[PDB]
Amino acid sequence: ATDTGGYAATAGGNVTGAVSKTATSMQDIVNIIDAARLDANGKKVKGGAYPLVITYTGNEDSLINAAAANICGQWSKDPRGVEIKEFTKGITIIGANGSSANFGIWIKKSSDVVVQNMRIGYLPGGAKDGDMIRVDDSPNVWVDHNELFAANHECDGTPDNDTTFESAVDIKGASNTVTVSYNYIHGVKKVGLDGSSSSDTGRNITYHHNYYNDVNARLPLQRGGLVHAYNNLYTNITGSGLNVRQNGQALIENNWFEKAINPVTSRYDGKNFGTWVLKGNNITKPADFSTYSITWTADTKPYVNADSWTSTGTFPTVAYNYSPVSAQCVKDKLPGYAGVGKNLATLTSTAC
């Protein structure tokens, strides 16, 4: 249904008149989407001819396992990904239990796209924007119950010394409403951006019930707009957490932070700091920093850290209806709902 627990209101391909197809490989996904653009007469239709619910049964563990053993050999390879360009009829790509992919999903100028239960990791082509998931000029996208991973490590001699692997979920352009939920993101250096440049500001993103572990930064690197981060489990953050920039507003509530450096900050621009409303997290005052191993660092440019752990601004009325569970409940239960193979389960107060 349209309820995603966030700003995105979409059902993807699970609508009336949808056609279900099974993909056993990346190639099939491409061929299926391509066929879905032709009407009864064999003519193409703008935005697609009919809704789709593609179930991916392929498994590329062999590619993933070989990449994991040769981390530094991935960045120079050709990037692999299925591009969903200008398809608006509605599309849901569900990975079948047991499936895995060594290719990304790149959404471009589309709408109502749902990506669920996909295990994507160690993609090749980091030097050529090999993102695991990319949302560009695409409103109403829902990235739910996926496992996005790689190795939180940078190899030597990589272009820009930042391209060993690319991001987990990059959002940019007119991707006005998006919900990123129940994802198990681990071992990723650059998790994902929310705005590709200082000029690419806006969008309303909801990050909830995501379990991040062993990640370096960008949770997200927010550029303007609104970001509602609730019920996320943030552990072992090696660089920085939510980086609220270009005057962005964030509502950080009922989250669990632990072993994290600069969990909530605004840095790198040296100006136009974003704001945050802090409520109901495991941390309530600076006295809890030592309790949960929270450390802060400075930046060479003017920056703002939430080292006082107090709200620095306001946040509009959260449009959608949601009910956050307690920070303690996410810490105790979230790991069992986030990720693939959980049958798209959701954490409720009744399970606390």
Ligand SMILES: [Lu+3]
């Ligand atoms: Lu990218």
